[PDB]
């Protein structure tokens, strides 16, 4: 597909990355597309990297993230060559311990981006992404449908607290070429 879904202005995501190292955007994509992505997530659960030509919903997600790639390059000069992503479905009780996405070891992943897909999430459900920001500040993100979180991979440690219900997301990374051919 060649359709490009509606999304809020990317300039704000880029300014946030520059100023704070991270950005969060509610309703990043229209609700019908987010639901279609939730559906594809469940379909795949029943690593499958996502590429154009696999499903309509995914094609539209990639088109938007490609726009975000070009916007990031423009504003922050990162030389990002591509975006890789895949679905993730955490069973109730699953958690992800504190970690950094990019090690100090040349890792090509420069910027992380997670799109959440869960309708009707409540705080009793847990499952927040917890981000460890500068100055010892912590920030929880509830994995609410349509919510996009973007951050610098080498900079923001983060974890996922266990949820009481299936937790759906689309997780990815913008990458540089890197020094190894
Ligand atoms: O799903 C989330 O919110 C967090 N995901 C990750 O930290 C990851 O896949 O590396
Ligand atoms: Mn991570």
Short mmCIF file of N, CA and C and ligand atoms in Angstrom, two decimals, residues 96 99-101 109 112 114 129 151 156 158-159 171 173, ligand 2:
data_model
loop_
_atom_site.label_atom_id
_atom_site.label_comp_id
_atom_site.label_asym_id
_atom_site.label_seq_id
_atom_site.Cartn_x
_atom_site.Cartn_y
_atom_site.Cartn_z
N UNK A 96 9.37 -7.10 31.68
CA UNK A 96 10.65 -6.91 31.00
C UNK A 96 11.50 -6.08 31.95
N UNK A 99 16.52 -2.21 31.35
CA UNK A 99 17.50 -2.40 30.28
C UNK A 99 17.65 -1.15 29.44
N UNK A 100 18.73 -1.14 28.66
CA UNK A 100 18.94 -0.16 27.61
C UNK A 100 18.80 -0.89 26.29
N UNK A 101 18.23 -0.23 25.31
CA UNK A 101 18.06 -0.85 24.00
C UNK A 101 19.38 -0.91 23.24
N UNK A 109 21.15 0.70 16.61
CA UNK A 109 19.88 1.27 17.03
C UNK A 109 20.12 2.57 17.76
N UNK A 112 14.40 4.54 19.68
CA UNK A 112 13.43 3.48 19.93
C UNK A 112 12.05 4.06 19.80
N UNK A 114 7.85 2.74 20.33
CA UNK A 114 6.88 1.73 20.69
C UNK A 114 5.49 2.32 20.50
N UNK A 129 5.15 0.97 30.78
CA UNK A 129 6.56 1.19 30.50
C UNK A 129 7.05 2.21 31.53
N UNK A 151 12.21 7.31 22.12
CA UNK A 151 13.35 7.76 22.94
C UNK A 151 14.71 7.40 22.36
N UNK A 156 18.07 6.09 27.54
CA UNK A 156 16.98 5.93 28.50
C UNK A 156 16.77 4.48 28.93
N UNK A 158 14.87 1.54 30.71
CA UNK A 158 13.42 1.39 30.86
C UNK A 158 13.07 -0.05 31.17
N UNK A 159 11.86 -0.26 31.65
CA UNK A 159 11.40 -1.59 31.99
C UNK A 159 9.89 -1.65 31.78
N UNK A 171 6.84 -2.62 18.55
CA UNK A 171 8.10 -2.09 19.02
C UNK A 171 9.13 -2.06 17.88
N UNK A 173 12.96 0.18 16.10
CA UNK A 173 14.19 0.98 16.23
C UNK A 173 14.58 1.56 14.91
MN1 LIG B 2 13.47 -1.80 25.37
#
